[PDB]
Structure formats: structure tokens, C-alpha cells
């Protein structure tokens, strides 16, 4: 399942927390997956080690 992140503002930043320890992660540039207010929402896939942003309302 994938894990609950944030996302920072346009200055493209995400936080993830895992079991145990938590860590960063980043996320692209694209228009489509950037964040237009910190704290938005944010994902992090372990399986492909890929990190994708979103937001919404």
C-alpha cells in the first residue's frame, strides 16, 4: 500500500514516514505532479522507488 507523504511548496519537497525511521523524498517538477502550497499531497512508491506529488481543493 502505498505510503502517506507530504509535499513542499513549488520549491518541489516531500516528507514520507516509514516503520521505524522516517525519511525524504522528492518529487518532479511537472506542472501536473508540482505542489502549489506546502503541505500538500504527496505519495511514495517503495516497489519502483518512485516518488509522485498531487493536490487538490
Do not use: M, Q, W
Request: overall charge positive.
Amino acid at each position: 500500500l502505498e505510503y502517506k507523504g507530504e509535499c513542499f511548496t513549488k520549491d518541489n519537497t516531500c516528507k514520507y514516514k516509514i516503520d521505524g525511521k522516517t525519511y525524504l523524498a522528492k518529487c518532479p517538477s511537472a506542472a501536473n505532479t508540482k505542489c502549489e502550497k506546502d503541505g500538500n499531497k504527496c505519495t511514495y512508491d517503495s516497489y519502483n522507488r518512485k516518488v509522485k506529488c498531487d493536490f487538490r481543493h
